[PDB]
DNA sequence: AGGACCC
DNA sequence: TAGGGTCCT
């Protein structure tokens, strides 16, 4: 059975949130800085050659008038990220988050419901909303085309709601599985949407210039695949199944080979409430294990306010570190009476004991709360 | 714990 | 070269 999936992906999300706070940043090229990294920038800045994730130096050298704002505190972006998801959940309850500014929504049931409500004459006036990938011709007698055009109409409505209710612009992609939705959502940026009819699936997949660009294939699998002389999507498409299982295991092998064909049966899962709460900090160095205790107290402070607000309780805590010049973690359950909520001083002895069990009394420190209930 | 992947 | 997240072995 075919599906209609939508992938919603916001424009320069952190930048966009900062530009709604202080409008004085509109019309100015804008980057959001975290330590020595420009994590994202507005499209005014991408015109000037600034790119996502280039360090501050490279960015000021390329754009000396670039405005930098600090984005080390995710509180505002996180609040907005969930307003967006909750809005999308109004359309269909089953919404899958991916990072802070992407959502998958399975529009299938919605699409069929709207067609059940259309009169025959009304069914030939069905029009696309936005771009059709590869400028492909629509065949109104093709049931799949009709369903994907309705999918595109719902997408437009979503985007219109996010601008009208939260003042946010973004892109959307409508396709038949999650993978295709997310590959097509990027074809026209910013603030536009694109629909992929089936005939054009191979065109879209082959539009990629290397397997790294396929969601599901990262730095490890990519580098592994290169060692086998697989560099294009068609290489992976035509590569030998058996040989691929042996180097990657039947799992990674079969899933990514199907991906290379545009085929993706994975369902849109309901993300619901977060599975974990964490904060972290990086620095030049921290060999003051008494000072590390101060940093840990600061991290833990905010997390308490956040986890409290959620209304569920974590039954496990974790501490994470990174050694000089490759991360390590140590966890433990959370004492039952401690869950009953001065909870700091208790937690600080726990985390420090976890600290010392990991290090003998320094470039990162992180606290995670998981096992929520 | 760690590792892979994602944004 | 940041600050987050998911799920699997
Ligand atoms: C990929 C990535 C994103 N982010 C944050 C910054 C981004 O604003 C936000 C969403 O990431 P993206 O959707 O990848 O990028 P974007 O929305 O900023 O840019 P685009 O307009 O091209 O879609 O998440 C990081 O902090 N680190 C990362 O490595
Ligand atoms: Cl499968
Ligand atoms: Mg985005």
Author numbering: 26 to 350, 356 to 371, 378 to 397, 403 to 414
Task: List sentences from the manuscript.
The Polι1-MeA.dTTP ternary complex (Rfree of 24.9%, Rcryst of 20.5%) was refined to 2.6 Å resolution and contains Polι residues 26–350, 356–371, 378–397 and 403–414, DNA nucleotides 3–11, incoming dTTP, 1 Mg2+ ion, 1 Cl− ion, and 87 water molecules. Clear electron density was visible for both the template 1-MeA and the incoming dTTP in initial Fo-Fc and simulated annealing Fo-Fc omit maps for Polι1-MeA.dTTP. Template 1-MeA is similarly observed in the syn conformation, presenting its Hoogsteen edge for hydrogen bonding with dTTP which remains in the anti conformation. The 1-MeA and dTTP bases are almost coplanar and two putative hydrogen bonds are established between the N6 and N7 atoms of 1-MeA with the O4 and N3 atoms of T (2.8 Å and 3.2 Å respectively). The 1-MeA.T base pair is isomorphic with the A.T and εdA.T base pairs in the structures of PolιdA.dTTP and PolιεdA.dTTP, respectively. Incoming dTTP is anchored at one end of the dNTP binding cavity by hydrogen bonding interactions between its γ-phosphate and the side chains of Tyr68 and Arg71 from the fingers domain and Lys214 from the palm domain. At the other end, Hoogsteen base pairing with 1-MeA secures the base of dTTP in the binding pocket. A single Mg2+ ion (metal B) is coordinated by the triphosphate moiety of dTTP, as well as the active site residues Asp34 and Asp126. In Polι1-MeA.dTTP (and other ternary structures with purine templates), the side chain of Asp126 undergoes an ~30° rotation to establish new interactions with the backbone carbonyl of Leu35, the metal ion at site B, and with the α-phosphate of incoming dNTP. Overall, Polι1-MeA.dTTP is well poised for catalysis with a 3′-OH modeled at the primer terminus located ~3.1 Å from the dTTP α-phosphate and aligned more or less linearly with respect to the scissile Pα-O3′ bond (~162°).
Humans have four Y-family polymerases – Polι, Polη, Polκ, and Rev1 – each with a unique DNA damage bypass and fidelity profile. Amongst these, Polι stands out in that it does not rely on W-C base pairing between the template base and incoming nucleotide for catalysis. Instead, the active site cleft of Polι is much narrower than in other DNA polymerases, favoring Hoogsteen base pairing. As such, Polι would appear to be well suited to bypass 1-MeA, which has an altered W-C edge but an intact Hoogsteen edge.
